[PDB]
């Protein structure tokens, strides 16, 4: 049952900032019965904020869908770009609050792409984030401007989408152990 629980006339506006990459070490969780060298995860974060007309009495909207697009150079075929895609659906998105969305690449994805643990160079070649509310686009971020803005829509032989090098939501990473108020709850696979 995915119909709005809110005012069906409610409209939503989303302000996006930029997607930025942070290299973050995997937590070494301590245990009672007593240590590996932590590997480096790629953590892509984008600040956003939600407003609505009218404002929901609960102070939240049901859900927002984030679509992440990341392009990298194929490390096995150098004249080709790989396009990586991930949809993250958040639930109970607060209104009027500095919030963040995020997606991740594993240490082995980063090492395979770049050749070294933790990465090197500007290995992220293109970035994009599209936000949808009730199936309609309400915000777009891109690392490109003008004609190249929506690069993820460009059909070209030099860039191919792959499900390999999988993009992961926070609940698909070891950072799920760290509950932070700034990220909304992620809707589980249905």
């Amino acid at each position: 049952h995915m119909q709005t629980t809110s005012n069906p006339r409610m409209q939503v506006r989303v302000s996006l900032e930029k997607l930025s990459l942070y290299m973050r070490q995997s937590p070494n969780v301590l245990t009672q019965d007593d240590l590996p060298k932590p590997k480096k995860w790629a953590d892509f974060e984008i600040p956003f904020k939600v407003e609505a007309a009218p404002t929901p009495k609960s102070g939240y909207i049901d859900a927002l869908t984030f679509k992440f697009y990341i392009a990298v150079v194929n490390p096995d075929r150098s004249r080709q770009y790989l396009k990586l895609y991930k949809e993250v659906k958040y639930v109970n998105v607060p209104v009027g609050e500095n919030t963040y969305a995020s997606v991740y690449l594993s240490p082995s994805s980063v090492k395979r792409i770049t050749g070294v643990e933790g990465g090197r160079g500007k290995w992220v070649k293109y970035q994009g984030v599209v936000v949808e509310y009730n199936g309609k686009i309400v915000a777009t971020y891109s690392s490109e401007r003008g004609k190249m803005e929506k690069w993820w829509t460009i059909q070209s032989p030099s860039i191919v989408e792959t499900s390999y090098y999988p993009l992961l939501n926070k609940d698909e990473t070891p950072f799920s152990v760290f509950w932070y108020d700034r990220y909304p709850e992620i809707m589980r696979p249905n």
Copy 2:
């Protein structure tokens, strides 16, 4: 999913009551703590004690599975004229016979704050509760917060009660409680 056991075996489940506990999520210690440290908030943890018996008693001491259906009703915080009906199925596997154990479902801190308006909840924000237990697709036990004609309130078709998959009810393995209190509950069957 045919039974690995005697297909004529029947099962009886003794339920106690579903109780709500507000509980902080575990604050896990790490080698290099992050700055700032995570400040866990309070989850809604709905707990129901139960015990199983069977005829005849399975030689292994366990039954294959039991399905728990949870029904929770709250006031829609966005349209206070109506109630929201929240639903969750939890399929437990390897359920021991003759042993006190527990079933549970959860609401996140943001679901609780959205429903009640304050972090950690306030008031009697849970209006109705129900738990239905099935074995091999047959109802064997029912708990309800209501009596009389309102007992099976989750079967009432009404415009003032609306089911929603938002405010999602979570099973334990869908929460930060997954690896804790492991012996208190049976194993949960993963999504198929």
Copy 3:
């Protein structure tokens, strides 16, 4: 989108050792507030590829695990347990591990005691696929019974109960991360 991202002429070879059972405690995770035995089936393996990929990795390998135990609810019958684990970004030329797990309650139900007793694992098998083709097979049996998981017989019954779990479906998910490749999510 599961076509290869590699050189399409690449040939992949996988060398398996043997599947072995370890009974292991779940991690006792320390928390700010206060500071049962799983079955852990482990199989070492190593990948080689010709030509060697520039990135040092292949896209994926699919591991199919087959485990047979005596049905504790009827002694004249075997239960066959099955699990597919798809690994991604599998390094080439590097000794690594694959694994599958049974919960404490599965082990206690099968054997009658926490932690297990006896040689309760009766048959084992691991089949590895690359791009949908079998590239390696391990079995606890040789001869006619080698591929015992393909034998149709009323004395062995497949069940999704006693579920086999991948590492990310267990409390071991965030530990020993360097020992195994990444697991592809559902």
